[PDB]
Design a binder for this molecule. Structure first.
Ligand code: HEM
Ligand SMILES: COc1ccc(OC)c(/C(=C\c2ccc(O)c(OC)c2)C(=O)NCCc2ccc(O)cc2)c1
Length: 445
């Protein structure tokens, strides 16, 4: 076997940590240009064997959990925040069973009501923005998305109980995903660690109360929570309340910040492309209805231009820029054998802005998919939600949430950038959020 082309680090242990923190996408891009598609790293005592390009990423996107173990990478971070016996804590077959049980709930029947729920919530929430002014797009969209995700997934019982205190609790729970989670161990009683732990206990307690109330409820209502409760394991064991709580606080916490940043990025891209925003509003006027009636899942499929805009936003600025895996058996890609112990990586951000196939890589143009383009030509060139075996179980929910939030938002206002300052990428956060998000909005005529 041959080890993959190994980059050389001046620092023995820390490696390229500072460079990756400063500019991960650019660092990966130049490393690709200099050492091919299978260049390796050395970051904090770990070898980050990145796979760039479709051919290299095919290994990660077609690998099995017996070969590329996600748990050995994500357990120490996801177990304390989500719960025990849920998410990545369980073995891989139980994890697959949980994933399919969750995917069963997110169906067309539930989406038909989710569209109306999200439309109502965004129409009510964006009343405070007034006729015109400037606002923090990222935070407002995060607050809207947490409301909509709660109302749709957890149900009216949980949504009604939602207030500023529990919103801050959810923000604190998301605060568990940070640098300290990776570098520092689960031994130090850091105040961030104890905040996350207390938030998880309080959230699970209120969720236990809500689950008991729903179970005792006589009236039958179809929801994600009800579907999870009715559905049992493959063997036949009824789902425990602890497991159900873990499922739902995993679902919502996994879509609150990977959907807020995408919505904000699409908003800024549409503000920069005023002609594209005008075309999108014209579509909202013509294909949904001249009187602009409330949206429905049937009309969602008619918003092809908005779908293309969301696709281009995800291509340029993916929320999840890295999907890590832990090698445990020797694997070969591009002729280079990766020994077990290397943190096999993949970049759903660099994979979509490579100049080899993505022409005008950094140019926002939601018309590329109208013609032939890598997203259809190549297997794993456009992978914002993942592809192959490892995909998001809620990409449909994301495409029905963002395309119902932004449809109403474009129906309401006429977004326009301020001082021509397109927000940059804040690499400090694990999900790259726009830097200083401020937009000068005006009410649509
Ligand atoms: C633009 C929106 C979103 C993007 C780009 C995105 C991206 C991703 C990606 C790339 C993965 C793969 C992680 C892995 O394979 O290790 C993932 C996993 C996941 N996604 Fe999302 N996500 C989004 C929103 C959502 C939404 C709305 C939900 C609603 C349920 C959700 C639920 C999940 C869950 C539970 C996982 C767990 C891992 C798995 O399913 O394999 N995400 N997401
Ligand atoms: C902001 O919270 C997130 C958001 C998105 C994530 O995945 C896209 C993750 C993550 C791992 C992750 C950890 C730290 C990170 O910094 C990160 O990148 C943002 C990602 C993960 O898979 N969650 C869901 C796991 C799960 C599976 C099955 C189930 O039934 C219930 C839950 C964490």
């Amino acid at each position: 076997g041959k080890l993959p082309p190994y980059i050389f680090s001046p620092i023995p242990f820390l490696g390229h940590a500072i460079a990756f923190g400063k500019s991960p996408i650019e660092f990966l891009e130049n490393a690709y240009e200099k050492y091919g598609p299978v260049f390796s790293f050395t970051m904090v005592g770990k070898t980050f064997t990145y796979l760039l390009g479709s051919d290299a990423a095919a290994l990660l996107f077609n690998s099995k959990n017996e070969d590329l173990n996600a748990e050995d990478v994500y357990s120490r971070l996801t177990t304390p925040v989500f719960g025990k016996g849920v998410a990545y804590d369980v073995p891989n077959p139980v994890f697959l069973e949980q994933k399919k049980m969750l995917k069963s709930g997110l169906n067309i029947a539930h989406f038909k009501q989710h569209v109306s729920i999200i439309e109502k919530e965004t129409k009510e929430y964006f009343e405070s923005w007034g006729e015109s002014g400037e606002k923090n797009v990222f935070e407002a969209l995060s607050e809207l998305i947490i409301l909509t995700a709660s109302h749709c997934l957890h149900g009216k019982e949980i949504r009604s109980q939602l207030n500023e205190k529990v919103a801050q609790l959810y923000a604190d729970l998301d605060g568990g995903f940070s640098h300290a989670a990776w570098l520092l161990p689960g031994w130090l009683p850091l105040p961030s660690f104890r905040r996350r732990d207390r938030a998880h206990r309080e959230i699970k307690d209120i969720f236990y109360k809500a689950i008991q109330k729903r179970r005792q409820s006589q009236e039958k209502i179809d929801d994600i929570l009800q579907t999870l409760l009715d559905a049992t394991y493959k063997d036949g064991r009824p789902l425990t309340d602890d497991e159900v709580a873990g499922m739902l606080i995993g679902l919502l916490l996994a879509g609150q910040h990977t959907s807020s940043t995408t919505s904000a990025w699409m908003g800024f891209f549409l503000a920069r492309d005023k002609t594209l925003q005008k075309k999108c509003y014209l579509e909202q006027k013509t294909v949904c209805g001249e009187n602009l009636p409330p949206l429905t899942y049937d009309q969602l499929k008619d918003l092809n231009l908005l779908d293309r805009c969301i696709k281009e936003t995800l291509r340029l600025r993916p929320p999840i820029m890295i999907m890590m895996r832990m090698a445990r058996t020797p694997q070969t890609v591009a002729g280079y054998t990766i020994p077990p112990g290397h943190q096999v990586c993949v970049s759903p951000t660099v994979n979509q802005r490579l100049k080899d196939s993505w022409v005008e890589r950094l140019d926002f143009n939601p018309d590329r998919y109208l013609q032939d383009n890598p997203a259809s030509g190549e297997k794993f060139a456009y992978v914002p939600f993942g592809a192959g075996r490892h995909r998001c179980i809620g990409e449909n929910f994301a495409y029905v949430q963002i395309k119902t939030i932004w449809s109403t938002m474009l129906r309401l206002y006429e977004f326009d950038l301020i001082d021509g300052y397109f927000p940059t990428v804040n690499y400090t956060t694990m999900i790259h959020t726009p830097e200083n998000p401020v937009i000068r909005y005006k009410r649509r005529s």
